[PDB]
Design a protein around this motif. Sequence first.
Motif, mmCIF file in Angstrom:
data_model
loop_
_atom_site.group_PDB
_atom_site.id
_atom_site.type_symbol
_atom_site.label_atom_id
_atom_site.label_comp_id
_atom_site.label_asym_id
_atom_site.label_seq_id
_atom_site.Cartn_x
_atom_site.Cartn_y
_atom_site.Cartn_z
ATOM 1 N N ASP A 13 0.747 -1.102 0.101
ATOM 2 C CA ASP A 13 -0.431 0.421 -0.046
ATOM 3 C C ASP A 13 0.983 1.363 0.560
ATOM 4 O O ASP A 13 1.986 1.586 0.955
ATOM 5 C CB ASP A 13 -0.799 -0.310 1.301
ATOM 6 N N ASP A 14 0.661 1.845 -1.308
ATOM 7 C CA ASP A 14 1.968 3.162 -1.437
ATOM 8 C C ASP A 14 1.744 4.646 -0.014
ATOM 9 O O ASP A 14 2.893 4.693 0.195
ATOM 10 C CB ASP A 14 1.874 3.900 -2.653
ATOM 11 N N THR A 15 0.279 4.429 0.412
ATOM 12 C CA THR A 15 -0.071 5.472 1.237
ATOM 13 C C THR A 15 0.884 4.938 2.961
ATOM 14 O O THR A 15 1.578 5.853 3.330
ATOM 15 C CB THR A 15 -1.309 5.228 1.344
ATOM 16 N N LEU A 16 1.873 3.647 3.063
ATOM 17 C CA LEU A 16 1.622 3.632 4.040
ATOM 18 C C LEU A 16 2.538 2.595 4.051
ATOM 19 O O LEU A 16 3.316 2.658 5.804
ATOM 20 C CB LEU A 16 0.501 3.188 5.153
ATOM 21 N N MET A 17 3.090 2.053 3.427
ATOM 22 C CA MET A 17 3.914 1.461 3.682
ATOM 23 C C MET A 17 5.590 1.976 3.878
ATOM 24 O O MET A 17 5.769 2.392 3.347
ATOM 25 C CB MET A 17 4.192 -0.009 1.910
ATOM 26 N N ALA A 18 5.862 0.727 4.785
ATOM 27 C CA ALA A 18 7.906 1.543 5.015
ATOM 28 C C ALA A 18 8.820 1.258 3.613
ATOM 29 O O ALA A 18 9.186 2.539 4.059
ATOM 30 C CB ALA A 18 8.149 0.343 6.519
ATOM 31 N N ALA A 19 8.952 0.296 3.256
ATOM 32 C CA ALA A 19 9.685 0.473 1.639
ATOM 33 C C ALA A 19 8.899 1.212 0.590
ATOM 34 O O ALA A 19 7.850 1.519 0.653
ATOM 35 C CB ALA A 19 9.601 -1.562 1.343
ATOM 36 N N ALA A 20 10.169 1.473 -0.222
ATOM 37 C CA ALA A 20 9.742 2.579 -0.894
ATOM 38 C C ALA A 20 10.758 1.673 -2.482
ATOM 39 O O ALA A 20 11.388 0.629 -2.095
ATOM 40 C CB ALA A 20 10.013 3.335 -1.109
ATOM 41 N N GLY A 21 10.296 1.927 -3.896
ATOM 42 C CA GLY A 21 10.960 1.767 -4.549
ATOM 43 C C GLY A 21 11.356 0.534 -4.829
ATOM 44 O O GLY A 21 10.891 -0.642 -5.003
ATOM 45 N N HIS A 22 12.478 -0.912 -5.006
ATOM 46 C CA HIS A 22 13.113 -1.745 -5.458
ATOM 47 C C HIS A 22 12.648 -2.843 -4.481
ATOM 48 O O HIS A 22 12.419 -3.797 -4.640
ATOM 49 C CB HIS A 22 14.430 -1.762 -5.613
ATOM 50 N N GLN A 23 12.528 -2.261 -3.572
ATOM 51 C CA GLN A 23 11.877 -3.175 -1.553
ATOM 52 C C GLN A 23 10.511 -3.441 -1.199
ATOM 53 O O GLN A 23 10.230 -3.858 -1.057
ATOM 54 C CB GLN A 23 12.635 -2.275 -0.318
ATOM 55 N N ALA A 24 9.931 -2.392 -2.000
ATOM 56 C CA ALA A 24 8.634 -2.331 -2.268
ATOM 57 C C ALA A 24 8.079 -3.117 -3.310
ATOM 58 O O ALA A 24 6.953 -3.529 -2.621
ATOM 59 C CB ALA A 24 7.885 -0.694 -2.758
ATOM 60 N N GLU A 25 8.277 -3.109 -4.622
ATOM 61 C CA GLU A 25 8.268 -3.563 -6.170
ATOM 62 C C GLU A 25 8.388 -5.111 -5.822
ATOM 63 O O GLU A 25 7.302 -6.275 -6.027
ATOM 64 C CB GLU A 25 9.462 -2.934 -6.931
ATOM 65 N N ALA A 26 9.635 -5.611 -4.564
ATOM 66 C CA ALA A 26 9.809 -6.623 -4.272
ATOM 67 C C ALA A 26 8.539 -7.331 -3.492
ATOM 68 O O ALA A 26 8.917 -9.085 -3.187
ATOM 69 C CB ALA A 26 11.531 -7.137 -3.323
ATOM 70 N N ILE A 27 8.420 -7.066 -3.094
ATOM 71 C CA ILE A 27 6.728 -7.096 -1.807
ATOM 72 C C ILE A 27 5.762 -7.672 -2.645
ATOM 73 O O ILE A 27 5.421 -9.002 -2.155
ATOM 74 C CB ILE A 27 6.291 -6.114 -0.487
ATOM 75 N N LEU A 28 5.648 -7.168 -3.903
ATOM 76 C CA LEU A 28 4.391 -7.788 -4.687
ATOM 77 C C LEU A 28 4.654 -9.701 -5.407
ATOM 78 O O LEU A 28 3.989 -10.254 -5.164
ATOM 79 C CB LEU A 28 4.312 -6.855 -5.798
ATOM 80 N N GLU A 29 5.867 -9.610 -5.691
ATOM 81 C CA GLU A 29 6.307 -11.031 -6.048
ATOM 82 C C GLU A 29 6.492 -12.087 -5.011
ATOM 83 O O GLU A 29 5.660 -12.839 -5.288
ATOM 84 C CB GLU A 29 7.962 -10.690 -6.964
ATOM 85 N N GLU A 30 6.693 -11.461 -3.690
ATOM 86 C CA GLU A 30 6.773 -12.436 -2.615
ATOM 87 C C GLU A 30 5.023 -12.762 -1.846
ATOM 88 O O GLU A 30 5.515 -14.020 -2.196
ATOM 89 C CB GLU A 30 7.655 -12.134 -1.792
ATOM 90 N N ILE A 31 4.153 -12.069 -2.527
ATOM 91 C CA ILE A 31 2.779 -12.415 -1.194
ATOM 92 C C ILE A 31 2.296 -13.141 -2.891
ATOM 93 O O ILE A 31 1.016 -13.936 -2.447
ATOM 94 C CB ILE A 31 2.590 -11.018 -1.044
ATOM 95 N N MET A 32 1.942 -12.979 -3.844
ATOM 96 C CA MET A 32 1.649 -13.388 -4.986
ATOM 97 C C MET A 32 2.200 -14.614 -4.993
ATOM 98 O O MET A 32 1.406 -16.085 -5.367
ATOM 99 C CB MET A 32 1.926 -12.515 -6.982
ATOM 100 N N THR A 33 3.492 -15.402 -4.735
ATOM 101 C CA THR A 33 4.038 -16.259 -4.484
ATOM 102 C C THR A 33 3.123 -17.874 -3.786
ATOM 103 O O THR A 33 2.972 -18.189 -3.851
ATOM 104 C CB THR A 33 5.615 -16.492 -5.067
ATOM 105 N N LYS A 34 3.540 -16.835 -3.047
ATOM 106 C CA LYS A 34 3.346 -17.716 -1.310
ATOM 107 C C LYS A 34 2.124 -17.939 -0.850
ATOM 108 O O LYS A 34 1.438 -18.439 -0.029
ATOM 109 C CB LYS A 34 4.010 -16.612 0.124
ATOM 110 N N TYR A 35 1.472 -16.738 -1.365
ATOM 111 C CA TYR A 35 -0.230 -16.554 -0.905
ATOM 112 C C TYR A 35 -1.409 -16.489 -2.658
ATOM 113 O O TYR A 35 -2.711 -15.844 -2.306
ATOM 114 C CB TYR A 35 -0.788 -15.275 -0.113
ATOM 115 N N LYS A 36 -0.537 -17.268 -3.548
ATOM 116 C CA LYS A 36 -1.164 -17.656 -4.594
ATOM 117 C C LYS A 36 -3.145 -17.762 -4.827
ATOM 118 O O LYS A 36 -2.833 -19.176 -4.048
ATOM 119 C CB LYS A 36 -0.989 -18.705 -5.939
ATOM 120 N N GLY A 37 -3.547 -17.221 -5.344
ATOM 121 C CA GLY A 37 -5.023 -17.634 -5.886
ATOM 122 C C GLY A 37 -5.911 -17.177 -3.688
ATOM 123 O O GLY A 37 -6.726 -17.995 -4.146
#
Lengths: 599, 264
Positions: free
Chosen positions: B41-65
């Motif tokens: 969530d761009d509004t509240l999240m601690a990570a920015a840039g590459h560190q923010a982008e990296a979260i999307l991949e991690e969550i989609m894989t681990k919690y797919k569907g």
Amino acid sequence: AYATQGFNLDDRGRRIVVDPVTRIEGHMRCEVNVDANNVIRNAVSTGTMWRGLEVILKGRDPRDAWAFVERICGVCTGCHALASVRAVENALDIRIPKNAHLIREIMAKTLQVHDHAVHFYHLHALDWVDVMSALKADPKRTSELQQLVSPAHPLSSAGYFRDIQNRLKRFVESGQLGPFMNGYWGSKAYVLPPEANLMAVTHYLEALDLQKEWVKIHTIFGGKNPHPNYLVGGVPCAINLDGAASAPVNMERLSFVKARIDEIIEFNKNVYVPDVLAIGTLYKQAGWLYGGGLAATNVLDYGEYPNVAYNKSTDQLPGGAILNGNWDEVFPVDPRDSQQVQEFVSHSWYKYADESVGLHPWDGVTEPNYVLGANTKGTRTRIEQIDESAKYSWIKSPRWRGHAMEVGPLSRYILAYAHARSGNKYAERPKEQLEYSAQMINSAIPKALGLPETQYTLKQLLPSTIGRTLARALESQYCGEMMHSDWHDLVANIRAGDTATANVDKWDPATWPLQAKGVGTVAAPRGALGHWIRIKDGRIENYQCVVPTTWNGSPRDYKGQIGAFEASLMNTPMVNPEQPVEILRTLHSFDPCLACSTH
Amino acid sequence: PRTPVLWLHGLECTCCSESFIRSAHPLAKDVVLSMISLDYDDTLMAAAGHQAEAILEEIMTKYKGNYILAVEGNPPLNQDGMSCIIGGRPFIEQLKYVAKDAKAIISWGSCASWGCVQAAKPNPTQATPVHKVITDKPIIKVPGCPPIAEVMTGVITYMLTFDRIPELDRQGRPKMFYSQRIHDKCYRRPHFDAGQFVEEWDDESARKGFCLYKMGCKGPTTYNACSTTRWNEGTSFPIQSGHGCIGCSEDGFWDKGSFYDRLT
Ligand code: SF4
Ligand code: F3S
Ligand SMILES: [Cl-]
Ligand SMILES: [Cl-]
Ligand SMILES: [Kr]
Ligand SMILES: [Kr]
Ligand SMILES: [Kr]
Ligand SMILES: [Kr]
Ligand SMILES: [Kr]
Ligand SMILES: [Kr]
Ligand SMILES: [Kr]
Ligand SMILES: [Kr]
Ligand SMILES: [Kr]
Ligand SMILES: [Kr]
Ligand SMILES: [Kr]
Ligand SMILES: [Kr]
Ligand SMILES: [Kr]
Ligand SMILES: [Kr]
Ligand SMILES: [Kr]
Ligand SMILES: [Kr]
Ligand SMILES: [Kr]
Ligand SMILES: [Kr]
Ligand SMILES: [Mg+2]
């Protein structure tokens, strides 16, 4: 590589990209170049969104405009509506009744407090506070720290802090860190002790719960928050005391508003200002005085909050322009003067007939032109490194008489200080706040924490990221105090027999001049806001907005001068160039609103 | 474990995010700490840039569907999509990538649901609602500019409790919040029924809370919970505070004529 405004820009060092910039409103990309020692030597501000509100408004009814432009931003919600109704009223020579004036002022000051406090805790604090360090804190020592930082704050017991820490512990131990995931925790850029971190986390949670109460003032007068309703000619919230929930505003509703104001005053005095003073003191002690940028030289605000409606000499945040760091000379700023406020698009994704000139907003033009420069790394739809020698932002470049200016609470506080030193008595309170703050930061807080006392002047302290953050907190406090006074004035006026809330004499477009132009200005939370309108045959002919983050986030102008964001990052060392902690800390001190900036 | 939510932002003003945090029952604090895992969530999240982008991949894989995609704002199709750029690429590419493996999609607000202000004529960015771009996933529309806080958290609460999207009307809105028109239970309705109307702002009728129909109130054609649930913990709603409904939860409300022109 070139020199401008005393800054030596150099793009030969290592390029770092931050996209997205998070904990802002909207969409921004930032790029910097760092030298061999990780010091920023170049900075590039790219607004990465555009919606085209100015285009959408063409041909519509001026009376509807406020609702459209209000949707420029849900964070600074209502300030655009206020600017719009003021612009239309200015165009049509409409004077609103006293109660409408006071209600708008109360709504404006409510927004200031809400926006400032939420910004600091929920968007900015994580740049200063290491939440993982809070887990190491001792609750007894945290209690003791709380009692030193703010003795009047009632939520200070070791048990309370222990409970908060325990909830954070369980949250972190779940393995689902949520908003703290992949954070920069443990970086040497963080300097607070564990106890200070736990205190700040506790207040983050307190603020998150309390902020929803403050906005109920908007709900009373404007129906809803976000996006309360406004009205050309006054306010819709008709007054009737005897009316018992039959009218929008009765005495019970006003008592409710006062209760919320009193709560705001307690929060600013006991939580927000003391936290910022304490955190500021500790970062000052660490030597982190970076981020001054243009605040050291050029600041601007339109001036706001007149004691007497329509009498600008009585502005309680008196404005104008300061140049070259000369605080002994405040130049008057006139939003109507075509040679003062102008916008360039030389380095923006727009087109003018002639891009060597800046347009005053009554003559403004908004025609998109998304095109990337020759030195771009990547493609039109996959940018790796943006080319700042060409067009690189959806944000226009506003300038004042050709000068690049910083806007915002810091600008307003520097101006207030300058005015107060020249004999302006309406600026006495901001001056008092600054002198108090300097003494706390230099002497009282260090003495209380066993740290060396310092002797920084306001000239030295204010133009800095710490100073920018402090000015926001002080402004929040001042706004709470002012709306407390406004409430008393409102109730007194109603009790004296004046219940009027709208002037409808020129509501019907058949009463309007066939052509008209107007301007409305607002001291919005992030700085100087203006809306400029041209009306023709009852319709909007032109509508141009120049918004605070447009000023601060602007790309370079025709002369190559840098704006406030770019200047603020210059000359700042990074602990680790792949962790944007310092970039975020300074950018966030401007409270960037990118939807605002681009509209 | 708490259900992951990936909250994306397109072209928007951020009102829906702000409204969400006004919720009193449940508190947004309790939603984030105890109900969902707000992982992006761009509004509240601690990570920015590459560190923010990296979260999307991690969550989609681990919690797919098994994550919820929440979307605030919308994608522009003009300017090659680069009127909304995220990580140097068009927002629409991020939207499609994250939407692929979502358990469900929430279109927050009129922006995501229908287009809202940026889609008003002449729509210079060709801003397009989520359901016109993502056509193969379950979507719930939660319209309004912004929606009521408790409607937003009410939707989340239902989805978390039951692991189901609530029953939707034909336009994809939850019947539990959008079954009534404002005009059905509006407290000024007895005035409407008795032909008692405000004709000019702050007239005697306005001071007695007469019906706002002749001042342009769009309550008779607008579905939302404003007249009953009301706003900001039931403090007020637009009509109670004296302005007509402008129709903000309805598709294309910006281009249905002046807000002050009465319905025919
Ligand atoms: S104020 Fe609007 S919603 Fe209420 S009764 Fe009148 S027309 Fe219907
Ligand atoms: S303007 Fe919107 S907030 Fe409710 S009263 Fe009408 S649907
Ligand atoms: Cl005003
Ligand atoms: Cl819409
Ligand atoms: Kr920047
Ligand atoms: Kr925000
Ligand atoms: Kr202190
Ligand atoms: Kr927590
Ligand atoms: Kr959190
Ligand atoms: Kr924090
Ligand atoms: Kr926090
Ligand atoms: Kr937290
Ligand atoms: Kr506040
Ligand atoms: Kr603190
Ligand atoms: Kr600070
Ligand atoms: Kr200071
Ligand atoms: Kr959510
Ligand atoms: Kr949120
Ligand atoms: Kr928010
Ligand atoms: Kr939250
Ligand atoms: Kr939270
Ligand atoms: Kr679900
Ligand atoms: Mg503009």
